[PDB]
Coordinates of C-alpha atoms and ligand atoms in Angstrom, one line a residue:
X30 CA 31.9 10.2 3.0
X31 CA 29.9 7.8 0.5
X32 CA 27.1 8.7 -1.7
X33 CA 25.6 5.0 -1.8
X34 CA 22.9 3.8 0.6
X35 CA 22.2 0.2 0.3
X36 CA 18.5 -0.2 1.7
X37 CA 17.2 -4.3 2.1
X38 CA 13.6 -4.7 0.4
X39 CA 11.0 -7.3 -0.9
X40 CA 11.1 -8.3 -4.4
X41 CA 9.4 -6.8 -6.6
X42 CA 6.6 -8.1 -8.5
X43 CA 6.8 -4.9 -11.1
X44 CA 8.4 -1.9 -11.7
X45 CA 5.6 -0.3 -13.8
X46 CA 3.7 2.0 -12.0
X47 CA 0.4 1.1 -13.7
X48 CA 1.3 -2.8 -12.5
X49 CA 2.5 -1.7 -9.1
X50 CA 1.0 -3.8 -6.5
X51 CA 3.3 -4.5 -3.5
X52 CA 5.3 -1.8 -1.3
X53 CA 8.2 -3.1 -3.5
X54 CA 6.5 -2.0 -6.4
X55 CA 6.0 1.5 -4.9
X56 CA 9.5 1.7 -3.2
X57 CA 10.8 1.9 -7.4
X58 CA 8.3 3.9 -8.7
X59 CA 9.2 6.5 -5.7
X60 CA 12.6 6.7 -7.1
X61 CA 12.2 7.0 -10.7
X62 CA 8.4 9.0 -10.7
X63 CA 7.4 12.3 -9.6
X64 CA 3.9 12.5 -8.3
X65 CA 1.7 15.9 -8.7
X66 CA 1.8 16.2 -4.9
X67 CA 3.5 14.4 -1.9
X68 CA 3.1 13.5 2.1
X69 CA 3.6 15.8 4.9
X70 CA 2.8 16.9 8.2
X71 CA -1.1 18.3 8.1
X72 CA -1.7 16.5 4.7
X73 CA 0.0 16.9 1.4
X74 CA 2.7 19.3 -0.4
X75 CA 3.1 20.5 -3.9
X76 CA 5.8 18.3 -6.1
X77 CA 5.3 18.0 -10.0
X78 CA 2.4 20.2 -9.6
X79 CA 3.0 23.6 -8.1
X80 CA -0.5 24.1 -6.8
X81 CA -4.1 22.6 -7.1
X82 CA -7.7 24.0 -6.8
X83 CA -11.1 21.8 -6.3
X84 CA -13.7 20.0 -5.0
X85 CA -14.2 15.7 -4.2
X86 CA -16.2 16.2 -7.8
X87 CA -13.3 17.9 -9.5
X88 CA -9.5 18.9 -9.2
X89 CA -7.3 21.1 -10.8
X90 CA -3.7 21.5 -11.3
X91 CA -1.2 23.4 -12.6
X92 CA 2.0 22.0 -13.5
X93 CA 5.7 23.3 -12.0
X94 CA 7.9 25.3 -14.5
X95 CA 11.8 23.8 -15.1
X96 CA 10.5 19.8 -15.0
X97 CA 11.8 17.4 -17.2
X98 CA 12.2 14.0 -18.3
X99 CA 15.3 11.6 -18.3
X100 CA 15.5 12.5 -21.9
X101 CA 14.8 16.4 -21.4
X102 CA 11.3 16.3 -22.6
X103 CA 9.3 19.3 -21.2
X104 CA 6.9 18.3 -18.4
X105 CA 3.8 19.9 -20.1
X106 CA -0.1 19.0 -18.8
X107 CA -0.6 17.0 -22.0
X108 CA 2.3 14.6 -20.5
X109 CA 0.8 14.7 -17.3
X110 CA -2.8 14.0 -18.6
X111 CA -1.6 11.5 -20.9
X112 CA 0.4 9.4 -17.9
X113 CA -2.6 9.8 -15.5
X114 CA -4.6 8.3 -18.7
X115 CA -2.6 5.8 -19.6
X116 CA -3.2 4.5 -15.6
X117 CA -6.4 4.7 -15.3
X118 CA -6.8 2.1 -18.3
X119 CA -4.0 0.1 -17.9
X120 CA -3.3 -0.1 -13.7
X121 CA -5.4 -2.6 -12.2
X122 CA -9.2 -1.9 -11.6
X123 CA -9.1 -1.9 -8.0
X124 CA -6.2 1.0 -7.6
X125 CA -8.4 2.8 -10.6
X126 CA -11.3 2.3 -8.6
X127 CA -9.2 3.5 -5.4
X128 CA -7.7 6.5 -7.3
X129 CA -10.9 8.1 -9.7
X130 CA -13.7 6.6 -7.8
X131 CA -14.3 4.8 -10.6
X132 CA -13.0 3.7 -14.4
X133 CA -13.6 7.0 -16.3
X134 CA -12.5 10.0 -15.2
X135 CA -12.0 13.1 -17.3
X136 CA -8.5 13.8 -17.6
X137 CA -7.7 17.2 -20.0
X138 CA -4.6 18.9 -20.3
X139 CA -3.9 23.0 -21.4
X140 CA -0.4 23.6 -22.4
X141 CA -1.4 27.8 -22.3
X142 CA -2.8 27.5 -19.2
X143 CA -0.6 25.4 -18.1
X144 CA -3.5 23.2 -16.0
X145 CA -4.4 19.7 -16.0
X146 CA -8.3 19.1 -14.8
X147 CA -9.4 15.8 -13.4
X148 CA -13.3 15.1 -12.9
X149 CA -14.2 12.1 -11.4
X150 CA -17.3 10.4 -13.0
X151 CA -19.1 11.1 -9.4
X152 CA -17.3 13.1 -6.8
X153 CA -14.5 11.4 -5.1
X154 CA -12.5 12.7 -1.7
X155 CA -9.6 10.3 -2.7
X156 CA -8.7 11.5 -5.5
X157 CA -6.3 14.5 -4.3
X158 CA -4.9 12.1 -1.7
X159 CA -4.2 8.5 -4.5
X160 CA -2.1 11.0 -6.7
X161 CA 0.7 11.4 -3.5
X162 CA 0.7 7.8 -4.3
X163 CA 3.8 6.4 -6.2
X164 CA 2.1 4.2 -8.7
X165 CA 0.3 7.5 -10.0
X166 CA 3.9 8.9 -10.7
X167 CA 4.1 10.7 -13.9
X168 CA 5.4 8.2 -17.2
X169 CA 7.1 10.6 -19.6
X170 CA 6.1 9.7 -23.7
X171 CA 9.2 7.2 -23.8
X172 CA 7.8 4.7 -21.0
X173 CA 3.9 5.3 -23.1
X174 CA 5.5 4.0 -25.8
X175 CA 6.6 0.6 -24.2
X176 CA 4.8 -0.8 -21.2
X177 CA 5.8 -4.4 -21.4
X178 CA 9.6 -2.3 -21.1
X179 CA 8.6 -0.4 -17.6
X180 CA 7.7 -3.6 -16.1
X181 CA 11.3 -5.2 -16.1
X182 CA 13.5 -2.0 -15.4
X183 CA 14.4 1.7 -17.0
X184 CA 12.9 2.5 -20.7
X185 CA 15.1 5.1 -21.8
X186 CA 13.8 9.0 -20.9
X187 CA 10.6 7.3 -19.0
X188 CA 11.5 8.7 -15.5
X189 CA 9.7 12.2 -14.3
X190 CA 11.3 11.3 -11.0
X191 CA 15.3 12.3 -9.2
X192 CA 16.9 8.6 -10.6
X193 CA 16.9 6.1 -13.3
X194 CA 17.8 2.8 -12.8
X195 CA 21.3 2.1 -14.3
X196 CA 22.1 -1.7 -13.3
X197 CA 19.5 -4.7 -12.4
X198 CA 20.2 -8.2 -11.1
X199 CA 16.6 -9.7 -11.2
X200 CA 15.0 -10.1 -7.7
X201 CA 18.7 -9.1 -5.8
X202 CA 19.8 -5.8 -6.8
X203 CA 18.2 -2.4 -8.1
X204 CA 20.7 0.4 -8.3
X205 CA 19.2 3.7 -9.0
X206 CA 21.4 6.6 -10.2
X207 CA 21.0 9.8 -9.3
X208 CA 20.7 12.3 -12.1
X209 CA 22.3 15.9 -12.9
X210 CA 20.1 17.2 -14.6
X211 CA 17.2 17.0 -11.8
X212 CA 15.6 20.0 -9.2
X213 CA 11.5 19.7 -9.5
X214 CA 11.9 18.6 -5.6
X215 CA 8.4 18.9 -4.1
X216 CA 7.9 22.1 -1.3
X217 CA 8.4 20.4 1.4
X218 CA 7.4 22.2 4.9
X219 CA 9.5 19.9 6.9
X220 CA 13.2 19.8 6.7
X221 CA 15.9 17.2 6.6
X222 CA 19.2 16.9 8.0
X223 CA 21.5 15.4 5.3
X224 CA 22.3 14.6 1.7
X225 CA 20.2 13.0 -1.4
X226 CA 22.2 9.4 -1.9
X227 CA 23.6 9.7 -6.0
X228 CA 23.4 5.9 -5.9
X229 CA 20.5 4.0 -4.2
X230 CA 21.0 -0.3 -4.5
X231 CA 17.4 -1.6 -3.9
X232 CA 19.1 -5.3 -2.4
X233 CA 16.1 -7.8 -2.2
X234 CA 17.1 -9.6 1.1
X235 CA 15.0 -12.8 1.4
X236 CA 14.1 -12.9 5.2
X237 CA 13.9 -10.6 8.1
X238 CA 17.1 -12.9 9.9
X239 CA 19.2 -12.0 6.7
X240 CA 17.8 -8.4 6.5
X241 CA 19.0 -7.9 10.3
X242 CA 22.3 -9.8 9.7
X243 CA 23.4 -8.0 7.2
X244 CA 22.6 -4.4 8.6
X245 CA 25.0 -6.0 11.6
X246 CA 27.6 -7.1 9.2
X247 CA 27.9 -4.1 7.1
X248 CA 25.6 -5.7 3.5
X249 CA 23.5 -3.7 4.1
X250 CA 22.8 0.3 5.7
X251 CA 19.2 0.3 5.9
X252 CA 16.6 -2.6 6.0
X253 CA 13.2 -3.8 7.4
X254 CA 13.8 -6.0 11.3
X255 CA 11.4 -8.2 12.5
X256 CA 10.1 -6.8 16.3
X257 CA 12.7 -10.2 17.9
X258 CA 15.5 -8.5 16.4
X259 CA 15.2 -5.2 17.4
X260 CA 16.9 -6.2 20.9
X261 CA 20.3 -6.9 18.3
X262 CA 20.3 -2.7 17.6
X263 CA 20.9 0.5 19.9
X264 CA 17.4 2.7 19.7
X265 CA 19.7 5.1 18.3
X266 CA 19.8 2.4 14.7
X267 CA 15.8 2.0 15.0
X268 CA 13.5 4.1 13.0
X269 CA 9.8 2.9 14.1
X270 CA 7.1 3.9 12.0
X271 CA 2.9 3.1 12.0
X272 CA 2.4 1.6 9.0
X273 CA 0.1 -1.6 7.3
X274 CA -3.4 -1.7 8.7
X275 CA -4.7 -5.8 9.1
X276 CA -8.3 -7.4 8.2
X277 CA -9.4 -10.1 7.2
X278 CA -10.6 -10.9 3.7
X279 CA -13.2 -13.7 2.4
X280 CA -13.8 -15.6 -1.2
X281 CA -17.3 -15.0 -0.6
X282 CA -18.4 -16.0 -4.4
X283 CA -21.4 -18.4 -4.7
X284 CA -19.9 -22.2 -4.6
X285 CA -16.9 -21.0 -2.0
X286 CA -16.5 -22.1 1.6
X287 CA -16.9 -18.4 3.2
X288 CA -19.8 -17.4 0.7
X289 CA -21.9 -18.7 3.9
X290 CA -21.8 -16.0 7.0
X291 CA -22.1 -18.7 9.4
X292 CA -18.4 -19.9 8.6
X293 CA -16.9 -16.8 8.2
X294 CA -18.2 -16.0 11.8
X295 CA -16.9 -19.5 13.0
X296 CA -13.3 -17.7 11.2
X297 CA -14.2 -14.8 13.9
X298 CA -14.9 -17.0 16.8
X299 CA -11.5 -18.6 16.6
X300 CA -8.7 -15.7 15.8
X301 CA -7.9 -14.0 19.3
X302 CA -6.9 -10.4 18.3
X303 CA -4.2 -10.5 21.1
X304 CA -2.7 -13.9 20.5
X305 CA -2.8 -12.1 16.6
X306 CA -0.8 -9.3 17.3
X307 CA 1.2 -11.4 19.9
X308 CA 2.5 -13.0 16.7
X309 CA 2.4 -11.0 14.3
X310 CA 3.8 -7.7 15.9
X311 CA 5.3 -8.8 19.8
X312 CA 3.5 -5.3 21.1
X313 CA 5.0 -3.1 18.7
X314 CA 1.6 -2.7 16.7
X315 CA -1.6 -1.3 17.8
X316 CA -5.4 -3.2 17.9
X317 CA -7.9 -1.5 15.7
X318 CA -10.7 -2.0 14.6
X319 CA -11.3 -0.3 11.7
X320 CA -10.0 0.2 8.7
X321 CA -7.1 2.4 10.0
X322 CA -5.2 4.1 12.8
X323 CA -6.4 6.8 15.0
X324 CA -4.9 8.8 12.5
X325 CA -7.2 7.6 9.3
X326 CA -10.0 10.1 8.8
X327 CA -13.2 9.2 10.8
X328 CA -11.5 6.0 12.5
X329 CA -13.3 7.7 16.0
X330 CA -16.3 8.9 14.8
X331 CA -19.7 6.7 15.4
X332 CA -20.3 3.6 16.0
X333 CA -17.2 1.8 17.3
X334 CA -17.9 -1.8 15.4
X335 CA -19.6 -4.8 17.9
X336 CA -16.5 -7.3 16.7
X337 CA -17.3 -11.2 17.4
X338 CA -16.1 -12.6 20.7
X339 CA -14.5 -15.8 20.8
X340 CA -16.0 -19.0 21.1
X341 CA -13.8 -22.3 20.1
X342 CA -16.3 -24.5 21.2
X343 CA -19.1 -22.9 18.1
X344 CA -16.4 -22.8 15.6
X345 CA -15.1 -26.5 16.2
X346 CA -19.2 -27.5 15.4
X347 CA -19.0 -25.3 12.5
X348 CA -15.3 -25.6 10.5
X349 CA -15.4 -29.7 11.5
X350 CA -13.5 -30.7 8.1
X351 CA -14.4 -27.5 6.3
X352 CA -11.4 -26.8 3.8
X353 CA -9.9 -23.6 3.9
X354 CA -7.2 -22.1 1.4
X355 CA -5.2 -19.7 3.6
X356 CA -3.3 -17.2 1.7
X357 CA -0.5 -16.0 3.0
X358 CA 1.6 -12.4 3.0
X359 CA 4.9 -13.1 4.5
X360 CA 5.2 -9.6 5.4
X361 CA 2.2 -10.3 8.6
X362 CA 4.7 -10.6 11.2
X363 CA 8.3 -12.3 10.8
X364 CA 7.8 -14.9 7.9
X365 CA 4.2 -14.6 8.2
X366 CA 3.8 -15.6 11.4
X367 CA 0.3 -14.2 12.3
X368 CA -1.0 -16.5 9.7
X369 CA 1.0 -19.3 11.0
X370 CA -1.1 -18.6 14.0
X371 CA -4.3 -18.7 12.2
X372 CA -4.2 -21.9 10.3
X373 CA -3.5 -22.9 13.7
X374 CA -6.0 -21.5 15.4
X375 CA -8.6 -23.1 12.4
X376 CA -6.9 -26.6 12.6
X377 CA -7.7 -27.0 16.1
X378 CA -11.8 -26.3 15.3
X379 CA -11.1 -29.1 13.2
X380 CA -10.9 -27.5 9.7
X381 CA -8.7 -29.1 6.9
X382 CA -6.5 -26.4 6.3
X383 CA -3.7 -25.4 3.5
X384 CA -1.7 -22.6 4.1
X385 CA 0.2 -20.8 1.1
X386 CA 2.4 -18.3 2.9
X387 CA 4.1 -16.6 -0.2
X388 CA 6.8 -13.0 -0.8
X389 CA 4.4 -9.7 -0.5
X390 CA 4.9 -9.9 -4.4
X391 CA 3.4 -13.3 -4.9
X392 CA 0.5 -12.5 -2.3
X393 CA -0.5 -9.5 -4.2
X394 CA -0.6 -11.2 -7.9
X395 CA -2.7 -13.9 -6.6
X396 CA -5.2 -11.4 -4.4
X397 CA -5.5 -9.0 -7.2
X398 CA -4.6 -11.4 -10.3
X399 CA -6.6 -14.7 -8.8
X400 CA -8.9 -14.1 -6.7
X401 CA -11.0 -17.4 -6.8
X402 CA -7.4 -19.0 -6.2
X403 CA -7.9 -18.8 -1.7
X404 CA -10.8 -18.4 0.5
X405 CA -8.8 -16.7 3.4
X406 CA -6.1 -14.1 3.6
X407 CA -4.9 -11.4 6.2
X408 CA -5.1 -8.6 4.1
X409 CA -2.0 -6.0 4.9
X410 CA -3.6 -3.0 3.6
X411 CA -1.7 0.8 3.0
X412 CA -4.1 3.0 3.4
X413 CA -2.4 5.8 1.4
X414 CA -5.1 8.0 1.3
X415 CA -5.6 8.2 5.0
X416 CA -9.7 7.3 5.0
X417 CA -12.0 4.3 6.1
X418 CA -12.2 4.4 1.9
X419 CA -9.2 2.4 1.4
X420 CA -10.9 -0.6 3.5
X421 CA -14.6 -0.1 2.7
X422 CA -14.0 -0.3 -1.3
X423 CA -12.5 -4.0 -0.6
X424 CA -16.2 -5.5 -0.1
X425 CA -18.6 -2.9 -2.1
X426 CA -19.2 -2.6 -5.4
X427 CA -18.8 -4.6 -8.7
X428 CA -16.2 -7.3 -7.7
X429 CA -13.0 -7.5 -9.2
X430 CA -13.8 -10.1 -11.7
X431 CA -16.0 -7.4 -13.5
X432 CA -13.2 -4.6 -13.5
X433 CA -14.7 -3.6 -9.8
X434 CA -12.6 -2.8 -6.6
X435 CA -14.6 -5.5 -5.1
X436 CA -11.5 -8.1 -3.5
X437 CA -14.3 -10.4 -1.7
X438 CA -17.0 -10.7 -3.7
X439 CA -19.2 -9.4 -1.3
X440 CA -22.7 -8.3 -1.1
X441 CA -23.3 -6.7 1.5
X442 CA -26.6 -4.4 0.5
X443 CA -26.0 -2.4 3.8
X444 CA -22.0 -1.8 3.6
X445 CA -23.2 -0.9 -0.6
X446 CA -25.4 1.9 0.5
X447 CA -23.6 3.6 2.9
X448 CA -20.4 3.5 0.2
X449 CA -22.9 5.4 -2.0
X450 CA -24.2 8.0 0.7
X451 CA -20.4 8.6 1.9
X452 CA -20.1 10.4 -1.7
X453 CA -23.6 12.1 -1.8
X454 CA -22.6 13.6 1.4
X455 CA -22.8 17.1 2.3
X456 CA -20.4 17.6 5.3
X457 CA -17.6 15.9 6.4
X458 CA -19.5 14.5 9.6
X459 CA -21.7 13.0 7.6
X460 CA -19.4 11.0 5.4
X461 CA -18.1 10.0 8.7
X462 CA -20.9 9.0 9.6
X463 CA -21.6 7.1 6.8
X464 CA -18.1 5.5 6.6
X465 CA -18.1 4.4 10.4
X466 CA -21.1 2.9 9.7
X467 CA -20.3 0.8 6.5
X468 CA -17.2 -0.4 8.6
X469 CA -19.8 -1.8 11.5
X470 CA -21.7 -3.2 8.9
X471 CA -19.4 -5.0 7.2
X472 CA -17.6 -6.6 10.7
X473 CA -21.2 -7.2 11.9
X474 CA -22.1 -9.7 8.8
X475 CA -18.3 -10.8 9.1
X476 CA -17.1 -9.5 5.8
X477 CA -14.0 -8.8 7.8
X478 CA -12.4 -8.8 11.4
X479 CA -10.4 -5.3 11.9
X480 CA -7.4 -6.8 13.7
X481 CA -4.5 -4.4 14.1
X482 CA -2.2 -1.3 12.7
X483 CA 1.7 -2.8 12.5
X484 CA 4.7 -0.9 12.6
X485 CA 7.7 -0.9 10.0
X486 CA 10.8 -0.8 11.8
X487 CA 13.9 -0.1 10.3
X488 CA 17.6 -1.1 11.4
X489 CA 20.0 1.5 10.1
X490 CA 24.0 1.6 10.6
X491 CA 26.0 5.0 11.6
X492 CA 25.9 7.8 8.8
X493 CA 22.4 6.8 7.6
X494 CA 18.7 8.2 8.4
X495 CA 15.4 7.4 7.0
X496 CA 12.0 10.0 7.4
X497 CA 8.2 8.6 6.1
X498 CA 6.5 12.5 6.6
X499 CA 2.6 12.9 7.2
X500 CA 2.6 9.0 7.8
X501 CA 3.4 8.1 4.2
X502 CA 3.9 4.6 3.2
X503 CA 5.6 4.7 -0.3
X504 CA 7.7 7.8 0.6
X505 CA 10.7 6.5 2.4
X506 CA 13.1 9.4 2.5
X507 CA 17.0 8.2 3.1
X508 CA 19.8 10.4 3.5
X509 CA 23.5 10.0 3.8
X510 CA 24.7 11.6 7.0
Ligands
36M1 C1 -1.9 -3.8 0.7 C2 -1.2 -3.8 -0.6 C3 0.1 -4.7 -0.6 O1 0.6 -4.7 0.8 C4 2.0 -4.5 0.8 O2 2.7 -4.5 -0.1 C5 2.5 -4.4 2.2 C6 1.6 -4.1 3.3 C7 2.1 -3.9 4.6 C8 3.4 -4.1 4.8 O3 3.9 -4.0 6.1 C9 4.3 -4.5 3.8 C10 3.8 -4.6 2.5

């Protein structure tokens, strides 16, 4: 009879949610934020916000009664509004981009009617979806007050959400504390067998060997297992669920390697998409290819993308000593295996390759922090809003560099088009329509190669569950048993 769950994680690269980055990132901000609504079966439930009414051009919503801060601050709309502003100018462009369609929203509180009203600057589908998202939890006035504070650990009456964090050990331990004063729980239509932990230790374990190890030896009570290990566990201490979606992603900037097609193609010719998930996921995953799971809005609808077939034989004329700058996400298979595999796969067509393979953390400050820094990465994407969206927004627009959500740089005039006719559209069947066609686009002029949805599987000892509802990423639900 314990009220402590010890759950193995990545390091985190931030604990802001404006900074938040890397499923670590989220992971905190779940505990210690409350978003307006959250995941479930059938799409999404009310939590800070009680209900919502609106359009993709404009939402409203109107907050709970009896929530609070970790100081005892009223939740009024004016905090709400002011959190949600204080995001979309100070997160990083792409999840503004991802969240609001864009950089300037109109974000209004009303204390008497007890509404907040967002109003994207063109109409945006996302938008209901991104605020389930943990990074769009809701900062109280103390954490406004001192963001260079909320990126290192607890500002004092900051958290809207059911714990504050009480101890940190730097990149080893997070212990979250559950507090008394706390029941703005979101109307959840599914229900779960067993208890809220009162003490939750985020323990950073460094590899999945360790992670698995120390489940086995009693360290730990939940953590992430590599697909070799699960063999080590009964079913009965696996909890499997679909999770990152894979694609490729360019530096397709003027002056870099993959700003010409013909070697991004040669890239294309070269990865097999079964040796891939082979590597990366032993069978456990699933082939896609598109910017999602069978589950992700449209992800059937037509065309099916025409994806490059291999030829070794091209690529080795093409990549003969072209230098590549593979970056890494040690999270794409055990140690970042699958792009083991793919420097691999490039050094035998006879390209000089480097191969950074860096902590989900690291990978995501240099993607979104550097992005003339590689010319290659396998992109681990959470799609949280369950849309082609997610993927499409990584290789249209502005690029990053000028506060875009553009990743890659890349122009494709085609993919940019039918981004902009997916929000001038009329019916759902259209904007799939449009999106399924933006995704063929964009693998037919080898922006990208879809290559597979993964699954996150959890080892957990006796005593201890863990539920992600309505295929929620950033929404891991423990409970002591
Ligand atoms: C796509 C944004 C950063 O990705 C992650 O943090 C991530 C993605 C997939 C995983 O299985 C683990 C982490």
């Amino acid at each position: 009879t314990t009220s402590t769950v010890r759950v193995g994680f990545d390091t985190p690269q931030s604990l802001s949610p404006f900074n938040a980055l890397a499923l670590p990132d989220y992971q905190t901000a779940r505990l210690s934020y409350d978003t307006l609504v959250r995941r479930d079966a059938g799409g999404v439930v009310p939590g800070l916000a009680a209900s919502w009414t609106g359009d993709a051009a404009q939402l409203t919503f109107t907050i709970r009664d009896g929530a609070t801060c970790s100081d005892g601050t009223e939740i009024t709309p004016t905090v709400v509004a002011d959190s949600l502003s204080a995001f979309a100018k100070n997160a990083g462009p792409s999840t503004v981009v991802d969240t609001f369609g864009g950089l300037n929203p109109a974000i209004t509180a009303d204390d008497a009617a007890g509404t907040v009203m967002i109003t994207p600057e063109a109409p945006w589908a996302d938008l209901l979806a991104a605020l389930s998202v943990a990074s769009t939890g809701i900062v109280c006035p103390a954490g406004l007050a001192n963001l260079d504070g909320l990126n290192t650990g607890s500002v004092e009456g900051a958290e809207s959400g059911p714990y504050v964090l009480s101890e940190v050990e730097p990149g080893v331990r997070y212990t979250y504390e559950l507090r008394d004063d706390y029941d703005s729980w979101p109307e959840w239509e599914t229900t779960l067998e067993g208890e809220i932990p009162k003490t939750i230790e985020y323990t950073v374990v460094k590899d999945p060997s360790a992670s698995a190890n120390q489940i086995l030896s009693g360290q730990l009570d939940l953590g992430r297992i590599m697909p070799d290990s699960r063999s080590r566990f009964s079913d009965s201490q696996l909890v499997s669920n679909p999770f990152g979606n894979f694609y490729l992603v360019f530096n397709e900037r003027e002056g870099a390697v993959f700003a010409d097609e013909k070697n991004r193609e040669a890239v294309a010719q070269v990865l097999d998409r079964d040796a891939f998930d082979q590597t990366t996921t032993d069978g456990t995953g699933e082939l896609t290819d598109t910017f999602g799971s069978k589950a992700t809005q449209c992800a059937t609808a037509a065309p099916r993308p025409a994806l490059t077939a291999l030829d070794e034989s091209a690529a080795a004329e093409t990549l003969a000593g072209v230098k590549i700058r593979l970056l890494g996400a040690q999270v794409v298979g055990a140690a970042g295996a699958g792009n083991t595999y793919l420097e691999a796969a490039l050094r035998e067509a006879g390209a000089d390759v480097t191969l950074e393979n860096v902590d989900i953390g690291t990978w995501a400050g240099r993607v979104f922090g550097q992005p003339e820094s590689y010319d290659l990465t396998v992109f681990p994407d959470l799609n949280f809003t369950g849309t082609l969206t997610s993927g499409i927004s990584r290789f249209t627009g502005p690029d990053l560099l000028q506060n875009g959500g553009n990743i890659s740089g890349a122009v494709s005039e085609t993919a940019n088009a039918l981004a902009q006719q997916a929000r001038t559209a009329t019916t759902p069947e259209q904007k799939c329509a449009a999106d399924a066609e933006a995704v063929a686009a964009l693998v037919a002029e080898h922006h990208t190669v879809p290559l597979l949805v993964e699954s996150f599987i959890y080892a957990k000892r006796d005593g201890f569950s863990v539920t992600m509802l309505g295929g929620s990423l950033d929404d891991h639900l423990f409970r002591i048993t």
